[PDB]
Every structure is written in structure tokens, then in C-alpha cells.
Tab-separated table of C-alpha atoms and ligand atoms in Angstrom:
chain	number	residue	atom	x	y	z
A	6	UNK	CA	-24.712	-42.560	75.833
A	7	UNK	CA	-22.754	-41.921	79.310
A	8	UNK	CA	-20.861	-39.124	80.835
A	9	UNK	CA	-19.967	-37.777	84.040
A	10	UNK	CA	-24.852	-29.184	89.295
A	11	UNK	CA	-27.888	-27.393	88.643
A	12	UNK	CA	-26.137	-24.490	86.908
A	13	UNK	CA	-25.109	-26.768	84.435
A	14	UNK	CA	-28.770	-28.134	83.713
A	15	UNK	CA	-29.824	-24.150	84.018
A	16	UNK	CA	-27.359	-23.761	81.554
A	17	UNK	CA	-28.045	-26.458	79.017
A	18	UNK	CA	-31.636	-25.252	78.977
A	19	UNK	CA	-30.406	-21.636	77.651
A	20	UNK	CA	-28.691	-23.520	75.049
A	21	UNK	CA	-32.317	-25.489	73.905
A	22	UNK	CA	-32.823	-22.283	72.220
A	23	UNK	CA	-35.780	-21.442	71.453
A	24	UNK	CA	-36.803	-25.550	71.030
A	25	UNK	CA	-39.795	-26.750	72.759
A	26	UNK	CA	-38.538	-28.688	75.874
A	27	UNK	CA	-40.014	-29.805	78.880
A	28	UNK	CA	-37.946	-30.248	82.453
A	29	UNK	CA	-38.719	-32.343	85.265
A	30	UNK	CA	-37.246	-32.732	88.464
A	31	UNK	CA	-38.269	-36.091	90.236
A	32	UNK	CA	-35.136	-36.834	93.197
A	33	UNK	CA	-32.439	-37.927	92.494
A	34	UNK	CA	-33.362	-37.394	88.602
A	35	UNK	CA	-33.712	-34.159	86.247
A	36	UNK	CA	-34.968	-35.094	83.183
A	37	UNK	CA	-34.770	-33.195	79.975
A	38	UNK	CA	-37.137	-33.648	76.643
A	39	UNK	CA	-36.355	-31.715	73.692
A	40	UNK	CA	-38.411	-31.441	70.656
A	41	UNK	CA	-41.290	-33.994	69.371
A	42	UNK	CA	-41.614	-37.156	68.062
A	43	UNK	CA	-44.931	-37.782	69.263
A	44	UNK	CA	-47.640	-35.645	70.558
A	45	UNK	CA	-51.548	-35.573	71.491
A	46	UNK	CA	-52.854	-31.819	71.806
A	47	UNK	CA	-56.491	-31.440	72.797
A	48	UNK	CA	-57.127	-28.150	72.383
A	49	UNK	CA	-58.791	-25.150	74.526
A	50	UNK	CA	-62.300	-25.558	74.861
A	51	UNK	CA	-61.873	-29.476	74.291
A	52	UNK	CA	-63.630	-29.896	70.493
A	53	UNK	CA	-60.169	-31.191	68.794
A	54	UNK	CA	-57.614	-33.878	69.780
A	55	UNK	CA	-54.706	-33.305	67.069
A	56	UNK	CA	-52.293	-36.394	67.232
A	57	UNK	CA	-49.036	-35.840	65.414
A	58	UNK	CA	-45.980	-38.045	64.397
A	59	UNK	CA	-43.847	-37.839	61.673
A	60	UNK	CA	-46.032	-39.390	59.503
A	61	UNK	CA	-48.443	-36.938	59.652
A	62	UNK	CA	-51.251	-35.645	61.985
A	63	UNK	CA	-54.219	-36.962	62.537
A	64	UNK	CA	-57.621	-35.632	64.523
A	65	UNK	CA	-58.803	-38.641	66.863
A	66	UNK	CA	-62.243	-38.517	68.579
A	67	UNK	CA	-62.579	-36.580	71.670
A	68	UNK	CA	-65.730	-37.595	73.246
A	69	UNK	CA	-63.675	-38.839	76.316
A	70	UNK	CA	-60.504	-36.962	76.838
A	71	UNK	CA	-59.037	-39.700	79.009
A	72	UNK	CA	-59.746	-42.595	76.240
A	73	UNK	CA	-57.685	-39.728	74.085
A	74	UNK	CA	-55.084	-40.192	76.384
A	75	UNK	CA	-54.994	-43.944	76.653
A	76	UNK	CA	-55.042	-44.808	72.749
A	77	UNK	CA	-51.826	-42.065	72.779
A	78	UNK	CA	-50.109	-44.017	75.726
A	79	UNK	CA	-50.886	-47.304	73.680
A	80	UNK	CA	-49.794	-45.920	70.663
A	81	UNK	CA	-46.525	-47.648	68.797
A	82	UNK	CA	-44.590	-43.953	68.586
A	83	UNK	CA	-45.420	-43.901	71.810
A	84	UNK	CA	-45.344	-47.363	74.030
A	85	UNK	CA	-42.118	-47.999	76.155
A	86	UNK	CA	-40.874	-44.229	76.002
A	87	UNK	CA	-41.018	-41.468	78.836
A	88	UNK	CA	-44.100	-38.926	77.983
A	89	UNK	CA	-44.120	-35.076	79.459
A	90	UNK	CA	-47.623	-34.123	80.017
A	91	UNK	CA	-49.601	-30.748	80.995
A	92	UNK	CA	-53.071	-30.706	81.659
A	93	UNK	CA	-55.246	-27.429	82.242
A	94	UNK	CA	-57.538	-26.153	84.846
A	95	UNK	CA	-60.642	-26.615	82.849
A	96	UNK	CA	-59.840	-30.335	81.734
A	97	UNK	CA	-61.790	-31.147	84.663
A	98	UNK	CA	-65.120	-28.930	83.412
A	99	UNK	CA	-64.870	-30.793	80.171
A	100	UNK	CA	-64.389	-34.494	82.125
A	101	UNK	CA	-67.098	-33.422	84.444
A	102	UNK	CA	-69.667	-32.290	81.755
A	103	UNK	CA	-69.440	-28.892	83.406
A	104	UNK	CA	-69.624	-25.407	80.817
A	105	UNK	CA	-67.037	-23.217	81.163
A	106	UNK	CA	-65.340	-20.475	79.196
A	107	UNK	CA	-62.185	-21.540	77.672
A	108	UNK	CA	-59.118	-19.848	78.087
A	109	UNK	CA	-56.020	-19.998	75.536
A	110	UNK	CA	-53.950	-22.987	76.459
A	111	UNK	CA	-54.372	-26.417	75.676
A	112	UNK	CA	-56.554	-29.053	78.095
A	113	UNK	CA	-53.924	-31.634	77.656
A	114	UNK	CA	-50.466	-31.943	75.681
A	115	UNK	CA	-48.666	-35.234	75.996
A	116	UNK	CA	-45.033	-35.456	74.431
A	117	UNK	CA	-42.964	-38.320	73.859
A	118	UNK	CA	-39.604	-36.337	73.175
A	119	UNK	CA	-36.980	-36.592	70.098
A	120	UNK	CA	-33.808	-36.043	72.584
A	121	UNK	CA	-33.686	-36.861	76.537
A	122	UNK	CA	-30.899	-36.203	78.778
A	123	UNK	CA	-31.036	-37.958	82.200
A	124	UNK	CA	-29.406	-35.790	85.275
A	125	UNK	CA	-29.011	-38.675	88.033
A	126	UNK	CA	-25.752	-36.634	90.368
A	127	UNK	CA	-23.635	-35.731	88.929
A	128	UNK	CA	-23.641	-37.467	85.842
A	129	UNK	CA	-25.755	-37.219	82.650
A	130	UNK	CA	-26.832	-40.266	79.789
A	131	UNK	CA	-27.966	-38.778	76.579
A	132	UNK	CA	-30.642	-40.141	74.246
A	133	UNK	CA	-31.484	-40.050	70.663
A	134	UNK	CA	-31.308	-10.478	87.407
A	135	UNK	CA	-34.839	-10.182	89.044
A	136	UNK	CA	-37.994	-8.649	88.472
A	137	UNK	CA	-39.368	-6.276	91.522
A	138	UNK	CA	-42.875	-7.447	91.842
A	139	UNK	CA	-45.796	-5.788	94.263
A	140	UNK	CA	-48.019	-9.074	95.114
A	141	UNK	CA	-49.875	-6.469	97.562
A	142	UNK	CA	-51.612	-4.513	94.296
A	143	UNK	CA	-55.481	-5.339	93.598
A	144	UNK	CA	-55.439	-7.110	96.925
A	145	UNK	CA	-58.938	-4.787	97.586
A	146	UNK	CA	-60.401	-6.531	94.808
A	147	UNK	CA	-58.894	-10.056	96.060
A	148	UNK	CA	-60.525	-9.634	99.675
A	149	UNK	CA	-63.860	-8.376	97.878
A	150	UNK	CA	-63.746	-11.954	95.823
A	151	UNK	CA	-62.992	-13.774	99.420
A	152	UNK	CA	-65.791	-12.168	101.113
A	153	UNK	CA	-68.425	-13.038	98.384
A	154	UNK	CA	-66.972	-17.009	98.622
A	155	UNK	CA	-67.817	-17.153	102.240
A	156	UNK	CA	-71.328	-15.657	101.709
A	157	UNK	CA	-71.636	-18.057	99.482
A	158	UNK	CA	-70.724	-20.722	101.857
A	159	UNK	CA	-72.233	-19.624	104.675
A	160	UNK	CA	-75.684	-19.881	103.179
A	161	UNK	CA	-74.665	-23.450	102.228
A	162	UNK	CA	-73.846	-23.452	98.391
A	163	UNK	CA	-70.792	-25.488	99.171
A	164	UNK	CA	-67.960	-25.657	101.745
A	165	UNK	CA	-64.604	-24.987	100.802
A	166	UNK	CA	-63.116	-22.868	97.338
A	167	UNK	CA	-59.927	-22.058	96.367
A	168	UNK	CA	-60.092	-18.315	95.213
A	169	UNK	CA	-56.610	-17.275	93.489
A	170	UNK	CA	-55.183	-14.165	91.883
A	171	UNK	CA	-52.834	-13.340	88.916
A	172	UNK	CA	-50.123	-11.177	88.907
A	173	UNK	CA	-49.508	-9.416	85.613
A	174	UNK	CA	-45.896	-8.748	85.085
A	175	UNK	CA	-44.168	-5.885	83.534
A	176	UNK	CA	-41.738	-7.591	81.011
A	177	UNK	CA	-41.452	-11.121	80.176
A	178	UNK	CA	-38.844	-13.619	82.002
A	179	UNK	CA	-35.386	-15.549	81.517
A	180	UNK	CA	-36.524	-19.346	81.969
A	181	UNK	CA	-33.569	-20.863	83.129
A	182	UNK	CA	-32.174	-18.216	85.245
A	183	UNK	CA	-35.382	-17.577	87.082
A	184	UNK	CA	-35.482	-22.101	87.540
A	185	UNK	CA	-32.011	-22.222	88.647
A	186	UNK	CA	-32.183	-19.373	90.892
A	187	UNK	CA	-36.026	-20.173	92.051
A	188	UNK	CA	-35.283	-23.535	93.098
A	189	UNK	CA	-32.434	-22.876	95.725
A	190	UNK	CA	-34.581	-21.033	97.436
A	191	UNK	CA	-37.582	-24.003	97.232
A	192	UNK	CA	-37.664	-27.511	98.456
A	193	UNK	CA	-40.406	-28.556	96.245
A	194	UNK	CA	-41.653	-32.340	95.873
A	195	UNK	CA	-41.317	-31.470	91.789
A	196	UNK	CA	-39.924	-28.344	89.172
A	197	UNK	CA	-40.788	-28.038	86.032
A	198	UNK	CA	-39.958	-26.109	83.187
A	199	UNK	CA	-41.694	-26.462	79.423
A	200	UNK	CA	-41.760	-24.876	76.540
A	201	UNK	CA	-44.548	-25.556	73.371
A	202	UNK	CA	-45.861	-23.958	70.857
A	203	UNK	CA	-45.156	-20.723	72.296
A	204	UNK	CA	-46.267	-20.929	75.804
A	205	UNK	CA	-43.935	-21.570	78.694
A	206	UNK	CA	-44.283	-22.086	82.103
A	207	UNK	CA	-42.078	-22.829	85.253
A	208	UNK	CA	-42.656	-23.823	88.610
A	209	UNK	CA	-42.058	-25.466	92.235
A	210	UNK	CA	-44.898	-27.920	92.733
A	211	UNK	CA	-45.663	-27.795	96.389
A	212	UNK	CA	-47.689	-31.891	96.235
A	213	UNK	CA	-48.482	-34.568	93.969
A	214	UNK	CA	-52.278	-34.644	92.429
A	215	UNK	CA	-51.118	-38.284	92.175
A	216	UNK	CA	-48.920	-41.088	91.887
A	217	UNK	CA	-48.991	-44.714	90.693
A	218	UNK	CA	-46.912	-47.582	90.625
A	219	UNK	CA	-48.287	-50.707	89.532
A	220	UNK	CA	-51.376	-51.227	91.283
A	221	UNK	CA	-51.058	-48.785	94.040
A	222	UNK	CA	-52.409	-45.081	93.471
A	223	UNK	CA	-50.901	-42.385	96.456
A	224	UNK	CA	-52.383	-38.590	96.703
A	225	UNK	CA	-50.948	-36.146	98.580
A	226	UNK	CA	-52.898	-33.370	99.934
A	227	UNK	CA	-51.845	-30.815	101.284
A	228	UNK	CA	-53.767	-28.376	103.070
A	229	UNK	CA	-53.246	-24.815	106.085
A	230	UNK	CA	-50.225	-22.490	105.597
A	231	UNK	CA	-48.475	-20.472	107.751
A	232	UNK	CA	-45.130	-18.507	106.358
A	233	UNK	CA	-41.744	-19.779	106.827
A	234	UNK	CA	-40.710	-16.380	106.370
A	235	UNK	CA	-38.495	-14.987	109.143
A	236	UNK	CA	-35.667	-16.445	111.697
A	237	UNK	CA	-35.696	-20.133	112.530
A	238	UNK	CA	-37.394	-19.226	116.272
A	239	UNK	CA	-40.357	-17.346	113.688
A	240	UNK	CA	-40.256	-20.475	111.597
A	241	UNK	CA	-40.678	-23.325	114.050
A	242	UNK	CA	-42.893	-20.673	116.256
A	243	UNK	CA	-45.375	-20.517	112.924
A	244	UNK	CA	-44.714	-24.257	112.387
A	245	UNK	CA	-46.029	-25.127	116.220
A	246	UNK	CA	-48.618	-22.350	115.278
A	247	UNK	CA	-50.130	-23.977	112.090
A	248	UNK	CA	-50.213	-27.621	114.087
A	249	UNK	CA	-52.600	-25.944	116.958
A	250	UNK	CA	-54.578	-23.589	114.668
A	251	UNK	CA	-58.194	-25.015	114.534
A	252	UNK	CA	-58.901	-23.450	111.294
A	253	UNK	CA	-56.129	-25.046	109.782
A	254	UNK	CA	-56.648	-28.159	111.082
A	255	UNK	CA	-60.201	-28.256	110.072
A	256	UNK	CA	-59.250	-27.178	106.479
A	257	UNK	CA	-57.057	-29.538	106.314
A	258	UNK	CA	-59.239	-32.839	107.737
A	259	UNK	CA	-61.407	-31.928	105.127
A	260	UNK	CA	-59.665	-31.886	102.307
A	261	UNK	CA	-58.312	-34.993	103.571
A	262	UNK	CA	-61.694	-36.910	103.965
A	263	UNK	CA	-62.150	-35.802	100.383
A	264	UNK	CA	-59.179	-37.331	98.855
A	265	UNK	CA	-60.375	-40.386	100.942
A	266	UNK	CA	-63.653	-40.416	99.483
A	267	UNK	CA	-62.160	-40.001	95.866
A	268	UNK	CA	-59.648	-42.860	96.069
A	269	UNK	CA	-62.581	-44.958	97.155
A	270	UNK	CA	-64.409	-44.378	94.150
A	271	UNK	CA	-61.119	-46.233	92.536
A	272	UNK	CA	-59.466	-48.490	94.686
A	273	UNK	CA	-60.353	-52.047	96.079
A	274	UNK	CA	-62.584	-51.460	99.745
A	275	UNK	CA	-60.691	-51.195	102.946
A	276	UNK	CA	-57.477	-50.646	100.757
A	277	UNK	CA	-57.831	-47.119	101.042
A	278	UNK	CA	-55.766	-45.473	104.454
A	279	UNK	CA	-54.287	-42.729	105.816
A	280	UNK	CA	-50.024	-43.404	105.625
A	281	UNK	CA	-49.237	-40.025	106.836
A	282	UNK	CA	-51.831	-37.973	108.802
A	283	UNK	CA	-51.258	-33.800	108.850
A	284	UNK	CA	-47.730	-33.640	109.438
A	285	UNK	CA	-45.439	-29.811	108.307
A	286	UNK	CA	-44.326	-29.879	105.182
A	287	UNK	CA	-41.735	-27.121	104.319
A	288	UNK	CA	-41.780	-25.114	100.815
A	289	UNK	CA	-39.848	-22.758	100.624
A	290	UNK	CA	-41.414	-19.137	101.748
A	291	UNK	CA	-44.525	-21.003	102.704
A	292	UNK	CA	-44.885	-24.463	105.560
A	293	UNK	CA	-47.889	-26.672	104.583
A	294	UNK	CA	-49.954	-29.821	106.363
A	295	UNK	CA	-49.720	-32.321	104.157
A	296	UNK	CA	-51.326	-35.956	104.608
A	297	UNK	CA	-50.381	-39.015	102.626
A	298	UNK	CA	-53.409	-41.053	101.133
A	299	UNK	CA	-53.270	-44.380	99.603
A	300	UNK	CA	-54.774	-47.390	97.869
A	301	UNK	CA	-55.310	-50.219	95.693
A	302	UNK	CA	-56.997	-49.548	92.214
A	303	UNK	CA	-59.580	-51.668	91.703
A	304	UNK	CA	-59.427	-54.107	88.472
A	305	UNK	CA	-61.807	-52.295	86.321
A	306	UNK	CA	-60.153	-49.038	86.965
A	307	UNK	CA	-56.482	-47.462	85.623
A	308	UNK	CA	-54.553	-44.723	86.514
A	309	UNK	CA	-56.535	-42.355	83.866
A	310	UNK	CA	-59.601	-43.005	85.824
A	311	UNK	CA	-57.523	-42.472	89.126
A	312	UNK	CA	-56.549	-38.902	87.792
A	313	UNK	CA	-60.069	-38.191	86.350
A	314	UNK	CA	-61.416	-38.496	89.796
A	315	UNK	CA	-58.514	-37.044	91.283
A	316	UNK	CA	-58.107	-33.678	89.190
A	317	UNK	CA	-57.988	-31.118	89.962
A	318	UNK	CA	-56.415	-31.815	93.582
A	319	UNK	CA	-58.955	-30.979	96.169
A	320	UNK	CA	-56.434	-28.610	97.676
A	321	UNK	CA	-56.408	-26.189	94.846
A	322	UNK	CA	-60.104	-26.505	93.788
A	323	UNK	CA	-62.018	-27.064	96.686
A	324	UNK	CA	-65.268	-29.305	98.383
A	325	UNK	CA	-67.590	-30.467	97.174
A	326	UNK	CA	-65.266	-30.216	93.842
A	327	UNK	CA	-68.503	-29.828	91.061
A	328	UNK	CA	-70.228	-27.004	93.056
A	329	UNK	CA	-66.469	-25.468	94.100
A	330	UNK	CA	-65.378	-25.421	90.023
A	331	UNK	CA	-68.717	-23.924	89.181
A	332	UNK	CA	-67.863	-21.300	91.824
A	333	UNK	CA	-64.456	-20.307	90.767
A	334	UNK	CA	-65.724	-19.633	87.119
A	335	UNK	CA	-68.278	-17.581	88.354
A	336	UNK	CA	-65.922	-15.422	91.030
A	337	UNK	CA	-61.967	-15.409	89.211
A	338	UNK	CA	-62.274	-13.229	85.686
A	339	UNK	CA	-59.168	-14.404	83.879
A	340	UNK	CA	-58.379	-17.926	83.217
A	341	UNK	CA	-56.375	-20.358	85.420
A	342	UNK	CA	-55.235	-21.813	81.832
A	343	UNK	CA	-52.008	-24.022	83.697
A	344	UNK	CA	-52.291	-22.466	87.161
A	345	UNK	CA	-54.333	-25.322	89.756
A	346	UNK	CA	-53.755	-27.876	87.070
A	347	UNK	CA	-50.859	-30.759	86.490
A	348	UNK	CA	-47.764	-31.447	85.225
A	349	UNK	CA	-46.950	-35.287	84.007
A	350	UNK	CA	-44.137	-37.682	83.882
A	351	UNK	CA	-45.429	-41.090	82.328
A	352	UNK	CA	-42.592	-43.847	82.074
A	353	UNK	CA	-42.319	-48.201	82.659
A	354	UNK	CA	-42.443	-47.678	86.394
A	355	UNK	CA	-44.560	-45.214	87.333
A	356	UNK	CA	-47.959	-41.943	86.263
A	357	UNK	CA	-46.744	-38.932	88.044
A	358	UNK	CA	-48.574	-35.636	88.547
A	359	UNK	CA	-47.287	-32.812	90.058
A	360	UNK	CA	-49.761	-30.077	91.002
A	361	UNK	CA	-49.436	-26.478	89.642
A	362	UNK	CA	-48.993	-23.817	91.961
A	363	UNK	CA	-45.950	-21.429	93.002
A	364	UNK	CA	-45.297	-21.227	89.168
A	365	UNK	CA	-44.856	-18.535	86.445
A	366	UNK	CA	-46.032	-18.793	83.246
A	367	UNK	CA	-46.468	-16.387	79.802
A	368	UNK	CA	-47.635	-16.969	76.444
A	369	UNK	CA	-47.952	-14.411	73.219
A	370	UNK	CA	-50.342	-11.773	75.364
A	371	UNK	CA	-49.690	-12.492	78.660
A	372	UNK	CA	-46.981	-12.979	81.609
A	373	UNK	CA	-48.189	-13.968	84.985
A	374	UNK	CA	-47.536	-15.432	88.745
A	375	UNK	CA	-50.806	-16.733	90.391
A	376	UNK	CA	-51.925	-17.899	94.155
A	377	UNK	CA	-54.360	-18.567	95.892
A	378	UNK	CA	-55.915	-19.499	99.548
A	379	UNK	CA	-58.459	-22.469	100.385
A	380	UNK	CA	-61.998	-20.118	101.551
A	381	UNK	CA	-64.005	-22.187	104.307
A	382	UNK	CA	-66.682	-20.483	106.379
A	383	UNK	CA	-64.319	-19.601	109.505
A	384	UNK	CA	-61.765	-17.692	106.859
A	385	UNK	CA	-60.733	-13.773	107.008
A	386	UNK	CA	-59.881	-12.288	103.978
A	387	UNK	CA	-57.114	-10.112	105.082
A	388	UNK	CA	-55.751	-13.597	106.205
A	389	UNK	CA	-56.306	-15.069	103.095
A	390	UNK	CA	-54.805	-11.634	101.410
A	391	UNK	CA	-51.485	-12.079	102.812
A	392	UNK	CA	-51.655	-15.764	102.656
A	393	UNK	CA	-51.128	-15.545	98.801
A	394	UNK	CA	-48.641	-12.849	99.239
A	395	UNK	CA	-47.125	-15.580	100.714
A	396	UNK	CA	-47.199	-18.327	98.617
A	397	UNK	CA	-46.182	-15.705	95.577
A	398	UNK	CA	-43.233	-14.744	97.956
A	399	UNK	CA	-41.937	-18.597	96.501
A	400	UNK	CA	-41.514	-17.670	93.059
A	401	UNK	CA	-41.916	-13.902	92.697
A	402	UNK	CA	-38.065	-12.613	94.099
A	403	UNK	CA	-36.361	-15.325	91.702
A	404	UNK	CA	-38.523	-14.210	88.609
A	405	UNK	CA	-35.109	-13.406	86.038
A	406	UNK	CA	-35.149	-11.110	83.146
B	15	LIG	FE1	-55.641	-21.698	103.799
């Protein structure tokens, strides 16, 4: 069902009430789930896989999360149709075999929707003001955490963390103002917005953990940050800055080398290459290197293995990734829950994972921004201080109440 921008999706979502919904924005499509038909919900610390239909719900064994995952994809509620996905930071301590302490959110959801409505400009098919926030407070604390991670890799324990920071916020936050509003001031390479079982969370996802299509599996790290915060001469001066900028650039080739390595570990040999090497990539308050990575999956592999390997994205958990998880348990003291971890769109063409960062999110006891800076051994903290100020500087002016 037919019929002939963005205010009018904002507005739509106000009128999914308080429904559970998930948004995605892939260009040139928005797409918009509303309530359940189908879902698998693996819950916090990863003892439970609940699958529920209308028939009923069932508990499935969870001794591999990712065969969880398959047998939903296969499953006949669920086979042909578009699924909205969220998995959590610590989904890759439970796939790894690694303890941690669980948070409150789930490790994965996956949702096949009841109703979808299709946004490809400026049409639709149908099936069946802001929060003052100070990112500068606790930053003592923040350059305290900084400093231990590069004791901790100078004396060799590993070689590159991300170390983030949460932002409690005073009262809780308009969803569909703060997304319309957020993203026209963001060019992201994804938004979301969902809502389930009480949680909710909204963001502009700065790079793709992964893609596939068919046979072919594409990463898309992203790695060094300078502001695009000021005039145009400050912008392309920080821009020309963040090219030349040895730190960066080492940051960055290193990160790459260990999406390389990962996709190996997946993909046919020799299919795995370098399509785009460190070029600027703009987001909004913040101007990234980015590199594209890409390969063949191998035939005893699929694109659940692909993401296994590939979550958390190097670029928000760090090198090498075991020892750099371990670290940020040890070092952050509340949990990442969403923050760091992906958002999925799962349809005939195509597995699509957006990573989480310069996003907002709040549940029953809690309402939060978070962001964080990639630690190696040459990093200052200050540096890395005002580096999340900047990233938060994304999201934080547009939060709406
Ligand atoms: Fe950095």
C-alpha cells in the first residue's frame, strides 16, 4: 500500500505512542517497524534466549548466541521479512568466553515487525526544546582513567583501548524531536531510533561494524578525530591537520591492519583489500579517517561468523580486542549496555550493522549520552578529554525534552 520530509517521519514516530518501534535510516530509505510479530531476546548476562511469536514463547538453547541467531533468521515467522536488531557491548564477552559483569539491557533483540512503513523521497508504502548539558563535568576522573590505560600500555599489556564516559542527564528526552532535530545537524552513514520493552535509544552512527551482500563482507573503520567545529577555514585547517598528524595516522593504520586481519579469519585468501585507504570522513561536530575494507567470505563461513569476528568494531573497543575488552571492564564503572555495540537491519539483499556511538539512550533508572577516545601509547589525556567533548558535541545540543 502506496502513497506519496523528515518532520513528517519525526512526526509519525510521536504518533507510535508509546509502541515499541524501531527506525532506521539506510539512504535513500527510512524504515519504520512497529510492534512484534516475531522476536529472539537473549537476555543480560546471556543464560536465556526467549523466542516469542504469537503462538507462544519458547526458551531455545543458548550455548552459541550466533546459532540463536541463525535458527531465528531461519525461522518460518521469520524467513523473507526485514528484522531490526540490537546487540550489546558485552555480546562479545559472552562470544569470546570472556567474564564480565552484566549490565541491564539485553545482548541481542532481533524483531521481525507487525507494521513497516517504507520512506524512499518523498513517498511512503505501508505494510501489514533542548537540554543544556556540561560534557566538561567528571572530566578529572576521565583523564585519571586515560592515564592508567596508557600505563597499562606502555608496560605492554596491550596497545590500543577505547576508554569512554557517560553523561547522566537531568530529565529524560523527547525521541522524535531530539532525532529530527539531531540529524540536521549530522551526516551520519546510519540513525536509529528504537523503542522495547522499556528501553530506548537514538543515535547517529558514525561507520558500519559491517556489511554483506551476497558473498562479499565490507567493514568500515574508522579511526583519528579532529573537530569540525568552527568556520569552514577552521574546518578544512583541522581536516589538513588530522591527514598530517602522526598520531592519528598511526591510530588509524592500526586499527586498519586489524580489521584486515579479522576479515582474513573469514574470507577466501588474497580476497581481502584495502578499497578506500584513510581518507576524511565528515560527522557532524566531529571529521574522522575512515578506510574501507573488503572481502570474500569463505564457504564454510556466513555473515554471523563475519560479525562474531567483527564485533565489537575495532574502533570502539580497541587492539588486541580480548586483552582491550578485558581492560575496559576493569577501568569504565558503569555499563556500556548499547553504547560501542550495533544496530541491525537484516532483509533479502543485504546484513547491516551500524556501530553505536554519538547516541542517547535511557531506560527505567537511567538517561545517558556516552563517548569515548581510542588510548594508544603516544595519547594525552587532556587531548583525549576534549576529544569526547567533541564527539558528545554531535548529539548533546539536539537532546529534546
Ligand atoms: Fe583518537
Amino acid at each position: 500500500e502506496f502513497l506519496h520530509w523528515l518532520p513528517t517521519i519525526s512526526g509519525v514516530l510521536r504518533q507510535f505512542a508509546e509502541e515499541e518501534c524501531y527506525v532506521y535510516e539506510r539512504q535513500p530509505c527510512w524504515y519504520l517497524g512497529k510492534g512484534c510479530q516475531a522476536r529472539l531476546h537473549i537476555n543480560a548476562d546471556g543464560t536465556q534466549a526467549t523466542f516469542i511469536d504469537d503462538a507462544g514463547e519458547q526458551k531455545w538453547a543458548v550455548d552459541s548466541i550466533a546459532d540463536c541467531a541463525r535458527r531465528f533468521m531461519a525461522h518460518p515467522q521469520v524467513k523473507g521479512r526485514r528484522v531490526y536488531g540490537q546487540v550489546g557491548f558485552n555480546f562479545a564477552a559472552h562470544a569470546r568466553g570472556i567474564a564480565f559483569n552484566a549490565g541491564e539491557w539485553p545482548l541481542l533483540t532481533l524483531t521481525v515487525p507487525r507494521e513497516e512503513l517504507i520512506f524512499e523521497k518523498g513517498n511512503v508504502t505501508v505494510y501489514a526544546a533542548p537540554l543544556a548539558v556540561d560534557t566538561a563535568l567528571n572530566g578529572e576522573a576521565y583523564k585519571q582513567q586515560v592515564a592508567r590505560a596508557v600505563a597499562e600500555i606502555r608496560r605492554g599489556e596491550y596497545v590500543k583501548v577505547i576508554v569512554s564516559r557517560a553523561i547522566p542527564l537531568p530529565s529524560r528526552i523527547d525521541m522524535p524531536a531530539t532525532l529530527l532535530y539531531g540529524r540536521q545537524a549530522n551526516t551520519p552513514v546510519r540513525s536509529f531510533m528504537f523503542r522495547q520493552e522499556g528501553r530506548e535509544a537514538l543515535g547517529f552512527s558514525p561507520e558500519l561494524v559491517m556489511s554483506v551482500t551476497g558473498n562479499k563482507v565490507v567493514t568500515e573503520p574508522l579511526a583519528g578525530t579532529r573537530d569540525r567545529m568552527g568556520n569552514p577555514e577552521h574546518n578544512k585547517a583541522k581536516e589538513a591537520e588530522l591527514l598530517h598528524d602522526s598520531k592519528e595516522v598511526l591510530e588509524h593504520i592500526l586499527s586498519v591492519k586489524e580489521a584486515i586481519a579479522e576479515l582474513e579469519a573469514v574470507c577466501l585468501p588474497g580476497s581481502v583489500v584495502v578499497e578506500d585507504l584513510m581518507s576524511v570522513r565528515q560527522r557532524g561536530s566531529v571529521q574522522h579517517l575512515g578506510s574501507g575494507v573488503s572481502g570474500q567470505l569463505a564457504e564454510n563461513k556466513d555473515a554471523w561468523d563475519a560479525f562474531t569476528v567483527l564485533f565489537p568494531s575495532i574502533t570502539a573497543s580497541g587492539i588486541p580486542k580480548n586483552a582491550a575488552l578485558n581492560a575496559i571492564m576493569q577501568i569504565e564503572k558503569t555499563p556500556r549496555e548499547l553504547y560501542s555495540g550495533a544496530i541491525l537491519l537484516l532483509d533479502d539483499t543485504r546484513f547491516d550493522a551500524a556501530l553505536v556511538l554519538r547516541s542517547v539512550f535511557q531506560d527505567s533508572q537511567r538517561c545517558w549520552i556516552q563517548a569515548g577516545a581510542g588510548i594508544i601509547a603516544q595519547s594525552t589525556p587532556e587531548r583525549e578529554l576534549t576529544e569526547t567533548r567533541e564527539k558528545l558535541a554531535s548529539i548533546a545540543p539536539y537532546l529534546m525534552v
